[PDB]
Structures are given as structure tokens and as C-alpha cells.
Amino acid sequence: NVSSGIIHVSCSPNNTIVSASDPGGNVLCWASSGTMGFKGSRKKTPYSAGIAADKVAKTVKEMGMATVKLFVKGTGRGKDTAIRSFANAGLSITEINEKTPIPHNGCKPPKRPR
């Protein structure tokens, strides 16, 4: 029911999540790897993120969307297959942005696994 908006993709190094959102900030629909069939360690694959973005793009096509912002977030190899699927799904993408949670050198991160 809304022409414009922002759809977010978070690419964790263990999972991926995509969430459509109204331009006001509130979300409209969202899917992820877990919502689909395969789960576990097999869900951190570029194919998983690609199909996750494909599903949300398809279900927002019936939701009546148009040119939409896109905020990639997180570190991981699945953040590009979602981009390609969004481009291939037939969307009206116009703007690309990056919204990583980049910190200034403040709080201490967890320890090195070794």
C-alpha cells in the first residue's frame, strides 16, 4: 500500500535476515534462513541469503512496492547474493547504502577463539 520504503538485510557470519520496512521506520514483512526449511549450520551460505531475499522481494511485489532503499549490515559472504537476487527479482532499486554497526574504539570485544 506504500510506494516507497526501505528494506534491510543483516548478514551475520552465522545467519542472514531480511526485513522490509515502511519509510517511517516500522517494518512490514520479514523472512530469514530459519523461516525456510533448512536450518542449522547449513543456513550460513550465500544461496540461503539469496533465496531469503528472493522470498521477501516476491511477497512484497504483491504488497505493492516501488523504488526502495537498501541498508546492508553485518559482516559475511551472503550480503552479495541477496543483492543479486533483489536485482534479478525485478525490483525498482534506486539507492544503495551501508549501515554496518562500525564502532569507534570503545567497548572491549570478546576473546580470540584459539
Partner: protein, 53 residues
């Protein structure tokens, strides 16, 4: 990091924005000593000296 005009010329430049974001963020997710911080910083600085010149 907003930049996009029509289809792909901005995406080709997105790769560079992300790679460097990834490199800088990768050292804020594991903790190691300050001495090692400086040592790896100087080692990375040597690497630029070898290729970029």
C-alpha cells in the same frame, strides 16, 4: 556510504566500500593486546609499502 545512480556503476564501487569496512571491522570483534595491536598495525603498514608504493 550512499551512492547510486542507475544500475551497476555504483555497485562496482560498493565492493570497494564494503571490503575496507570489512577489513576495519574484523579487528573489532576479537580482543588482543595493545602491543599486538601496534605490531599488526605496523605489519599492515609494511604491506602497503610493498605493493601500493
Amino acid at each position: 556510504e550512499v551512492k547510486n545512480d542507475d544500475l551497476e556503476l555504483a555497485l562496482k564501487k560498493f565492493k570497494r566500500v564494503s571490503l575496507e569496512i570489512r577489513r576495519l571491522a574484523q579487528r573489532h570483534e576479537y580482543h588482543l593486546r595493545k602491543g599486538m595491536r601496534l605490531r599488526e598495525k605496523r605489519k599492515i603498514a609494511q604491506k602497503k609499502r610493498r605493493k601500493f608504493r
